[PDB]
Amino acid sequence: DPMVSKGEELFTGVVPILVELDGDVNGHKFSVSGEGEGDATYGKLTLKFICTTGKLPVPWPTLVTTFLMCFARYPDHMKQHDFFKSAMPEGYVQERTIFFKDDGNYKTRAEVKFEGDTLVNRIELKGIDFKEDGNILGHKLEYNYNSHNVYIMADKQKNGIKVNFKIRHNIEDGSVQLADHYQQNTPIGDGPVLLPDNHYLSYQSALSKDPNEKRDHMVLLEFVTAAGIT
């Protein structure tokens, strides 16, 4: 399929990634830069994020979803359903509202696309209605991450996809903080895209710390595999 081909030829080896985030939560301003690389053949991504403005005023785990579904490993039988790659290199826009149970919400807008050989994810995040002393602004979330399936469906009338899922963040007291994600993606370009049958992406994520890094930061290792269409 010369369309499955165009995507193949962009994602076949290791692709460098850049992430840039501009955030304001309850008027707490911040910026984060990330660098790393993805190897979609293995569903694999390795990234290191740095808050370049000083202290991050929310917990790192709350940003993981916001900080590259084009790097999903789609099984051969499923390549006809990979919207993310089909949109490249012109890219797509990924928008979310993330509702933190009994706390505030994030609204995010990203553009994911190639800049030359580099895959770039440029994001704006606004958070509102947070409790200054809650789990988020009060930093009560553990530095870890659970595995999760993400259900993708077509959004045909918008020529894109809708994704809906819940993240449970572990709190220090042993309870969990739910973060209900609502997501919409639309291609940036005017050309055709693969619009998928209902399927899901399986995520595992590992958070760690660079021992030689003094700035506030997060090292993220993710594996992402499509499934759900036998």
UniProtKB/Swiss-Prot annotation:
Impact after mutating residue 49 to L: In mut3.3; shifts fluorescence lifetime from 3.03 to 1.88 ns. In R10-3; matures to the red-emitting state with excitation and emission maxima at 555 and 585 nm, respectively
Alphabetical UniProt keywords: Chromophore, Luminescence, Photoprotein
Impact after mutating residue 79 to R: In Topaz; shifts the major emission and exitation peak up to 20 nm
Consequence recorded when altering residue 162 to Q: In R10-3; matures to the red-emitting state with excitation and emission maxima at 555 and 585 nm, respectively
Impact noted for substituting residue 67 to M: In RSGFP4; increases fluorescence and shifts the major exitation peak to 489-490 nm
Effect of residue 193 to A: In mut1.5; shifts fluorescence lifetime from 3.03 to 2.72 ns
Consequence when changing residue 163 to A: In GFPB; leads to enhanced fluorescence at 37 degrees Celsius
GO BP terms: bioluminescence; generation of precursor metabolites and energy
Tissue specificity field: Photocytes.
Outcome after substituting residue 171 to V: In EBFP1.2; shifts the excitation and emission spectra to shorter wavelengths and increases quantum yields compared to BFP
Applied uses, from the record: Green fluorescent protein has been engineered to produce a vast number of variously colored mutants, fusion proteins, and biosensors. Further generation of mutants led to more stable proteins (at 37 degrees Celsius for example) with brighter fluorescence and longer fluorescence lifetimes.
Listed result of changing residue 145 to H: In mut1.3; shifts fluorescence lifetime from 3.03 to 2.78 ns. In mut1.5; shifts fluorescence lifetime from 3.03 to 2.72 ns. In mut1.27; shifts fluorescence lifetime from 3.03 to 2.85 ns
Subunit structure: Monomer.
Record protein name field: Green fluorescent protein
Organism (species): Aequorea victoria (Water jellyfish)
Lineage: Eukaryota, Metazoa, Cnidaria, Hydrozoa, Hydroidolina
Gene giving rise to this polypeptide: GFP
